[PDB]
Design a protein around this ligand. Structure first.
Ligand SMILES: Nc1ncnc2c1ncn2[C@@H]1O[C@H](CSCC[C@H](N)C(=O)O)[C@@H](O)[C@H]1O
Ligand SMILES: Nc1ncnc2c1ncn2[C@@H]1O[C@H](CSCC[C@H](N)C(=O)O)[C@@H](O)[C@H]1O
Lengths: 230, 230
């Protein structure tokens, strides 16, 4: 079944893989650097999972006002435990990326609103981008990088996808979780339309959606927008 | 690149796998039994590959008039060698499923015209079905079974597809050959319209296209028709 949150043994298996493969986050970190991330900024991570990105970002930028938000209570627990193990005082919240509920204090205050490998799981994609832009301060940036439906791969992308599937070993049932996340992923045009719809409500000075692979190992969609000036 | 014929080392690898996995042909043979295959009949196998099906059918029906046709001269060579090795007096021809050329002596004379795991590779699917119906005698049947684009899978179909990919060992580059054949495969609507187009030129008493998995291991499209009686 297509279910948004990752919970239970799957969430634990996800963390076991993620925490031991920090290099997989390199491409996303580079995009954040490209988007203009810097120490002291307020950054909101929607669908933060088990907090791998937060630990990475806080290490490079110790004065970041960083908050991770996830729909899974198991992921929020794990993230908090993980941050504590790493010796970091990071904030994680239970919440839905498709709603402002529980994030009203951050409304219009984020320098950077980000999401990695999650937006493909959502039921209401335009609602997620709406939340992104409303959390962003005027002049703030938003950046999603997530899975594309395999119909949008060219031959090279499809080959890379098969190669990724073939990696071994997978923890527990993480292979089919990864593969089904693609089966249920939106098309490029879905991402394009979702961001456009959100930008009509919250005006942007810039927006760009594209597909490439600059490190993760398979092509992924990137969605970037800059909220308009005040 | 999307290329119709399977040649060179890939053709050899295909045969090495095929000859040690006769069980994979069970679903297709059952369809032929359901279609009314019987000893002494004239049967044309379009895109016959290295002759695995021909040897299987010949063993079961020793007086079948079997002709296998393939675009790959390597497959034709291999098929003849394999037939000889297996002690079967079979005929193989170099030819194109999308044209009647080289099969003019068989026009309107086939009790059954069949093709397995090949039509997904073709450039002109309607031309292939046109050739099928023209080879069929009045009252004769045509049956294709081939790959569908993964977009047409439901979750169970997609899980089966991943499971098939996870099978070990694969010979040489056969995994990516099999996988890319799906990447480049037609949709269900493409198969349905192609057969319909052909049926408008060569009238049929019956016509049906469907997807299921009764043994091969992944869902495949079936395309069946019976040419109108004389
Ligand atoms: N509507 C929603 N709101 C918030 N989080 C969601 C969500 N739907 C799915 N998620 C979360 O998105 C995560 C996908 S896994 C990706 C985790 C993390 N961003 C990383 O890159 O490592 C899961 O933790 C899942 O619980
Ligand atoms: N236009 C065409 N005409 C005839 N054969 C073709 C063709 N395009 C591809 N082929 C052949 O289709 C085969 C696909 S492999 C499947 C082989 C066989 N039917 C089996 O079930 O085992 C290859 O041998 C390839 O050479």
């Amino acid at each position: 079944m297509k279910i948004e949150a990752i919970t239970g043994s799957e969430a634990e298996a996800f963390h076991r893989m993620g925490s031991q493969a920090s290099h997989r986050y390199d491409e996303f970190v580079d995009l954040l650097v490209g988007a203009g991330i810097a120490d002291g900024q307020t950054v909101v991570d929607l669908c933060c999972g088990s907090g791998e990105l937060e630990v990475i970002l806080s290490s490079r930028f110790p004065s970041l006002n960083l908050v991770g938000v996830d729909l899974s209570e198991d992921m929020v627990r794990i993230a908090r435990e993980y941050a504590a193990e790493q010796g970091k005082a990071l904030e994680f919240r239970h919440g839905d990326a498709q709603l402002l509920a529980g994030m009203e204090d951050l409304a219009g205050k984020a320098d950077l609103v980000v999401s990695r490998n999650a937006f493909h799981r959502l039921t209401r994609l335009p609602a997620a981008f709406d939340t992104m832009l409303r959390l962003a301060k005027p002049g703030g940036a938003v950046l999603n990088c997530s899975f594309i439906h395999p119909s949008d791969f060219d031959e090279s992308g499809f080959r890379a996808w098969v190669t990724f599937l073939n990696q071994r070993p997978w923890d527990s049932e993480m292979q089919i979780v990864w593969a089904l996340a693609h089966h249920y992923a939106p098309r490029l045009d879905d991402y394009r339309e979702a961001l456009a719809q959100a930008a009509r409500e919250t005006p942007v000075s810039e927006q760009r959606v594209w597909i490439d692979d600059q490190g993760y190992g398979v092509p992924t969609v990137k969605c970037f927008a800059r909220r308009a000036a005040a």
